[PDB]
């Protein structure tokens, strides 16, 4: 197992998926085409904001 952790904007939460381009996955953090495993996304307006 190989974990990850970061905090992004709520508009681009669907930008993370494999094969999607943009600016976050084009400059900061890309996922492979053959990505096995998955993400856990939840709102955190109470804590991080």
């Amino acid at each position: 197992v190989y974990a990850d952790s970061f905090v992004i904007r709520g508009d681009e939460v669907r930008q993370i998926a494999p094969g999607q381009t943009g600016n976050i996955a084009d400059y900061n953090y890309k996922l492979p085409d053959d990505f096995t495993g998955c993400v856990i996304a939840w709102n955190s307006n109470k804590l991080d904001s």
């Binding site: 998926a17 494999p18 094969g19 999607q20 085409d33």
Partner: protein, 49 residues
């Protein structure tokens, strides 16, 4: 590969890979039967001559 997102595109091109493979399989099968009726006539010519 340009418009479709990459994992879905792989689904839509499975039609074209097996669509042309069925076209070659059908074409080869007709030549296998058609070569049998020529060898039935090549052996008739080799018997007549």
């Amino acid at each position: 590969f340009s418009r479709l997102d990459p994992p879905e595109a792989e689904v839509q091109i499975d039609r074209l890979i097996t669509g042309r493979l069925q076209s070659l399989q059908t074409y080869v099968t007709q030549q296998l039967i058609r070569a049998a009726e020529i060898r039935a006539s090549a052996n008739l010519a080799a018997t007549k001559m």
